[PDB]
Amino acid sequence: PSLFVPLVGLLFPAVAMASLFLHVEK
Amino acid sequence: LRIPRFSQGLAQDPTTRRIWFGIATAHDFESHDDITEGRLYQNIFASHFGQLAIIFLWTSGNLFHVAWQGNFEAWVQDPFHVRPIAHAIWDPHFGQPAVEAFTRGGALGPVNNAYSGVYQWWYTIGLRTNEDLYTGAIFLLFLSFISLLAGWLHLQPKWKPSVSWFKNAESRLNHHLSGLFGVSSLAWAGHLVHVAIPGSRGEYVRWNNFLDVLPYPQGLGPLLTGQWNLYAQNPSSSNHLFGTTQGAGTAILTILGGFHPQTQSLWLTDMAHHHLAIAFLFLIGGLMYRTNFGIGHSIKYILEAHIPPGGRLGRGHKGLYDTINNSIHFQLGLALASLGVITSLVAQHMYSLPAYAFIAQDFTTQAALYTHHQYIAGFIMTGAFAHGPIFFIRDYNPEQNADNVLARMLEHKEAIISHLSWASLFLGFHTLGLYVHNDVMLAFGTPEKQILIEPIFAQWIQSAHGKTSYGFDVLLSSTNSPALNAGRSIWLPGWLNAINENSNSLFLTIGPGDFLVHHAIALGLHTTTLILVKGALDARGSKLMPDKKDFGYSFPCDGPGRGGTCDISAWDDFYLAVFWMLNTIGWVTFYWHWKHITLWQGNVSQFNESSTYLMGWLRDYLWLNSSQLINGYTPLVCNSLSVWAWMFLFGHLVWATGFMFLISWRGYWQELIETLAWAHERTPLANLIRWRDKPVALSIVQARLVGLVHFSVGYIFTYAAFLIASTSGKF
Amino acid sequence: PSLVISLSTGLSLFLGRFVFFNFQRENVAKQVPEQNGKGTHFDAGDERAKEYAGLLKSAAAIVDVLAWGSIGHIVAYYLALTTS
Amino acid sequence: SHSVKIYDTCIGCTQCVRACPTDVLEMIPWGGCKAKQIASAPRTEDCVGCKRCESACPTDFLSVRVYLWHETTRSMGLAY
Amino acid sequence: PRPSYLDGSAPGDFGFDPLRLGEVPENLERFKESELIHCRWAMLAVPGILVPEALGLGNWVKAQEWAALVPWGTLPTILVIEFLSIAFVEHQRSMEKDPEKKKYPGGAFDPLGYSKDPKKFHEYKIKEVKNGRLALLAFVGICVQQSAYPGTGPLENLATHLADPWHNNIG
Amino acid sequence: PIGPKRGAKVKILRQESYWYKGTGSVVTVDQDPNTRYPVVVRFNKVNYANVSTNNYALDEVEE
Amino acid sequence: SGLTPCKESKQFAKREKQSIKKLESSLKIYAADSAPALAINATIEKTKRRFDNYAKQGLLCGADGLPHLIVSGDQRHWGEFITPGILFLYIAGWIGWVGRSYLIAIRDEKKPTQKEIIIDVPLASRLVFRGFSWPIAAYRELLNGELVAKDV
């Protein structure tokens, strides 16, 4: 339960940092 | 073309400077491309709904975790001997001794001990079960949504308001006073008499039975008839058990004053009465200014009419109405100023007059909350003094403000600044002087030669409040006067009982040690104000730079010409004041915490003697309370204070890192990077990869910021780690 | 007793209508109502309100009624509450 | 790029030009002062914004003013 | 010397305005009106507080303690009456046409016609002020004295009793 | 020949000058109508740039 | 003023005894007749003397056993602040007035800054004593103690 979510709270930075990187270099 | 889209001049920067500055200017709407007054106002109005959405979501989560991972129910049944739980801990890096030490409060796993005081707050208002907490979380989640819905709604053309609508101040005041302040206070008094008070006494009044349960034996009649004393006939007994129908009266509105003896908190009946009382002033007051019905005032005209003849204020406040309403920086600086003042008023009144049950005994929570709000109040004050200069530079019209009170400040600015300098220089020369002097003799082993000025003026105030200590014979503690007898029982007997309590923080005993520190704080206030107003009054220009008006609030400098012009912008003056602000609040929080942890240990004697000289502070306060903290993790063991020991060192590291950006400056780093740019180009297997943004050293202003951020973060985190651990360890 | 209410509400209405009516109106003329810019209503399309203000009576609008009376009730409750 | 302006309060001492290392300024025939010259800022594109020109100006407050605006490679002083 | 505006022709004008309070004309006329009224209430009152004391009533202070604890012998009753009436008169007196009737309403207020006279009306004025200023001063004297809570008259009696008692004061 | 004498003391009215409300001695005053700012002025105190003189506009008071 | 005077103090009295015993502990290793001996004993009499004097002059002494000064203005304790304060302002003004008087005399003619770094002008003609009567600067105030250049 609570051992599934803090990692998606770390999948999210991976996703966010990747998307933002594409946004800022465009 | 690129980020930032709101700034084309920024977006065409070939260097890494664009990414940084694109972030630091996102909320500065007035500097954005093709900005209009219309776009400005409903960007803020929409950003306003966004902030509300965050607050409600943030508060929803708090109600959620406490209901899901916090005992609360276990806490309710024995508020004295159980530790509140903030939330559970889940960290893969945790070793087994870690999971061990952090398992507390009767939890199945490692949790964090809440020091926000949400347990006492929620319990006092009438929350008794986890189910109640969930319904609140759902309701806040729903409130968080409709805030976004409204934000989206008014961004739509068919619902967007005109700027003039925003500038109708007369009606926004009338509603905010009468509705936002008055009604909400009135509605709260309803929750108190329907749920909080009966929930306190012992009955569970909720949505499925609140309709059928009288808040008072007698009907709603007595209110409408006129005789309202009937709401105070049967108050709660002094020996009353909270959450127990023992010695519980019937009255829903009183003025008893003092504290509920078991909880050490203010009476709920006093509060239900308080909000009801203040609601009216707000309600009537919100009907002062004119709207659409033909009666009311005009703010402008009142400002116009206030001109003292025969000088000496000039045109008084004429045209001042339009200067404020057309400038939202003035409004914000005016708002932060007022909010900042009462933010401290919260801190001062919430440790002296605890509002929630069983909060006074939670010493770690009491220290945290005070220290919390004082730093919050601190930063807010620096913001009120920051939007001040911005008003002068960006929105100030000298001609439209010809010879009025505002324009008279700039024409004798050298007077205000110099006397602030004097007052600061005066306080500093002696407060430091008296301290150092006292340390000398204790070094020389002669503490009887000290200068220990008795705060006799303040002690005169204390006796004037009801304290029978000292021989002063003043009001509320004297032999014949209109003041005390005006008590007419009611508040006085319950309150005079509370002031001469040697346990509570309600008017502590003060002496020579309290004298020196109060001057230190006075020194901190004056100096900080000196820096901030000097930045404001010289924002439009000085003699070293008469056209500073033409460069904006924040610019690096004006060059090395004319002797040198480093840190000459009004922004930098703010940035310099943030340092002094941290120092001031630092002295305030040091003074509050030390005097309390000595009181809580039943040893105020140590404070009264060690606070008169600075070595006492560093040793008996700093050194002495660090032992349990710095042994959070030992080369032998590992405690529950290991988090704070790590954060303590963490705070030191961030703090010292800021020093780099504050001492070392750009030209060194830029030349260093240029060598690294050459390197990357001439290194095989790495040539294939190239950067899309030119590597450059951080800007002159950026570094001052970045350095200040590090300095401030480490400042807070270090003391936070110490404030909690040292207090939690001993309790 | 309800009587206290009416007597005070009663006097107030009497005062506003006869005794203090001229002064009130006099101040309002020299005062309202909003500025910008100038005059409000130009933008912020709100904006009187002429009808309710309209009173076939030799003077006193309805608003006045609500306005004068309210003060009266407050006083009445003020006194009524106070004795107890 | 950077924004530079010249003011009629100038006296044509030509020191702002000699100070510039990128050649952003130059002298101009004018009837306003005894020198009958005046500074000019034609090549603002090559301006780095170092304000060397300002530290050579003898006029009570500067006749030449540099207003740091949008950044470019030339203004950033980059050689890479 | 003498201030520029204080001519001397004015009733009761002796050249006193050290803070230049009446330098502005339209408010000097405002203050002059304010003076008599303060003067008129006061003159009426001092006798009010002395004779009753003379008959015997524990001074004006104790005179007022009755409310604290026919016809309308109740504080509520009297208050409304004092209220509504003192309101009727006044905020009617406002007229603000010819300096509150030149500050001297006359007419029905001069049933015996002392206003008709030319020079007597003016000498009557200067007399009225001076007496009035005298009261105002007395009232203050009474207030300061009564602030100890005994008697305006009895005070006289006490000093009269002996010139030995001494005020000292701060002093 | 124009407004200010050769040895007359003069008060500055520029607002942007180091000597904004101060006084100063005049060196001379060129007579070319073309000249925007003649009226050269000496000062006892230098400014942040170590110059003691500056040329001013015709608008100033004397003393 | 919960403090009870240094005379009827048990703490302030105890503090005296504590300090002299420690000093006495030190002379035991030097043998009387020796130098470090008097120096210790001379320190002890000064200790007794200062404790003795403080009780004489009043001085209230808190619970901690140390004298607390009262600056309320109380006539009983004027010597604790007001009288030394009056003495300070006297000298403080005197210095202020003499210094001001100097820079004024220098300004006309000469190279004024020459006199500031070097003052081979001592008290000028005779400027120091002028401070003996500085307070008469109140009369300088009614005339031209201030320049009228900026504001009033």
Ligand code: CLA
């Ligand atoms: C009601 C509150 C309020 C509002 C609505 C505003 C609004 C505004 N402010 Mg103001 N300000 C406020 C309060 C407020 N302020 C207070 C209380 C202070 C005192 C510090 C200031 C000090 C201040 C300054 C000095 C400036 C403004 C500026 C501005 C304008 C642009 C800000 C911007 O987008 O840059 C972007 C903001 C950011 C990118 C913030 C990120 C950086 C901070 C340090 C992050 C927080 C710290 C850190 C990340 C914490 C991490 C720690 C971690 C280890 C846990 C905007 C109108 C600027 C302005 O007016 O332009 C001329 C400006 O220079 N404000």
Ligand code: CLA
């Ligand atoms: C390097 C060692 C290390 C690491 C990697 C961690 C990692 C973590 N700790 Mg542990 N901890 C450590 C050392 C460490 N800790 C030590 C030595 C101690 C003392 C013994 C502790 C004591 C401790 C406690 C008591 C707790 C943790 C918790 C956590 C978890 C945080 C939950 C979370 O991610 O929510 C989200 C992450 C954040 C909110 C961090 C945001 C802060 C950033 C920097 C500022 C905001 C960035 C901004 C938005 C910019 C946007 C960019 C972005 C979108 C990419 C995380 C797994 C907590 C936990 O278990 O979670 C339930 C918990 O309560 N730690």
Ligand code: CLA
């Ligand atoms: C009854 C009518 C009414 C009401 C209830 C409101 C209410 C509000 N308006 Mg609106 N407004 C109105 C009419 C009204 N307005 C009219 C007629 C106009 C113009 C024609 C406007 C134009 C307007 C604008 C332009 C804005 C608002 C905004 C707001 C919000 C203010 C921000 C906030 O939430 O803090 C509310 C503060 C409180 C509820 C308490 C007052 C503050 C005290 C000092 C706090 C202390 C209380 C207590 C001691 C502490 C308790 C703490 C404890 C509970 C933990 C608030 C919801 C702003 C917004 O959009 O929201 C973000 C804003 O931008 N209004």
Ligand code: CLA
């Ligand atoms: C404590 C604060 C602090 C720190 C950490 C540094 C660090 C550094 N300085 Mg600095 N300096 C400081 C204060 C500090 N300085 C002050 C106050 C001054 C004024 C004199 C200077 C003046 C100065 C000069 C003149 C120079 C430096 C240089 C350097 C760098 C040397 C190279 C290096 O060791 O890289 C390694 C980095 C570290 C050892 C920092 C800690 C690394 C952490 C522990 C590991 C990473 C953590 C983790 C992965 C982050 C991910 C977490 C995620 C959430 C983000 C290094 C970054 C030099 C330089 O430029 O490099 C040659 C240099 O020329 N400094």
Ligand code: CLA
């Ligand atoms: C109408 C004017 C007036 C009169 C007739 C009196 C009379 C008296 N006063 Mg009062 N007094 C007055 C005004 C007056 N006072 C004012 C305005 C104050 C406020 C400062 C005081 C404060 C005061 C105190 C504290 C005391 C008296 C006391 C007394 C009584 C004798 C002792 C004494 O006077 O000490 C001297 C007091 C003063 C000199 C105050 C100045 C009053 C002025 C100068 C007197 C009126 C001026 C005028 C020219 C008088 C000429 C006489 C004529 C008016 C009849 C005596 C009945 C004493 C008492 O209680 O005895 C039992 C008492 O100790 N008075």
Ligand SMILES: CC1=C[C@H](O)CC(C)(C)[C@@H]1/C=C/C(C)=C/C=C/C(C)=C/C=C/C=C(C)/C=C/C=C(C)/C=C/C1=C(C)C[C@H](O)CC1(C)C
């Ligand atoms: C106008 C007219 C006209 C018409 O037609 C007709 C007729 C009616 C006639 C008329 C008139 C009327 C009148 C006259 C009125 C008046 C009043 C007065 C004057 C009073 C007194 C007034 C005045 C006064 C009181 C004065 C007073 C005095 C005093 C106080 C003093 C006192 C005292 C004493 C003893 C002592 C004590 O220890 C204290 C004191 C206190 C100090």
Ligand SMILES: CC1=C(/C=C/C(C)=C/C=C/C(C)=C\C=C\C=C(C)\C=C\C=C(C)\C=C\C2=C(C)CCCC2(C)C)C(C)(C)CCC1
């Ligand atoms: C009594 C007392 C007290 C109090 C005090 C006070 C509170 C006061 C005050 C005060 C004040 C509030 C003052 C003021 C002022 C002002 C001004 C305006 C100034 C001036 C000045 C000057 C001008 C000077 C000059 C000079 C001289 C003469 C000397 C030298 C210097 C010179 C040269 C600088 C206490 C109780 C504390 C203590 C005890 C005693």
Ligand SMILES: CC1=C(C/C=C(\C)CCC[C@H](C)CCC[C@H](C)CCCC(C)C)C(=O)c2ccccc2C1=O
């Ligand atoms: C070190 C240093 C640099 C070099 C600093 C650089 C190049 C900053 C680059 C930092 C790297 C990219 C790592 C920083 C990572 C941060 C945690 C950023 C997180 C991402 C977002 C939160 C923004 C300067 O340019 C400078 C300029 C003026 C005065 C002092 C200094 C100075 O001290």
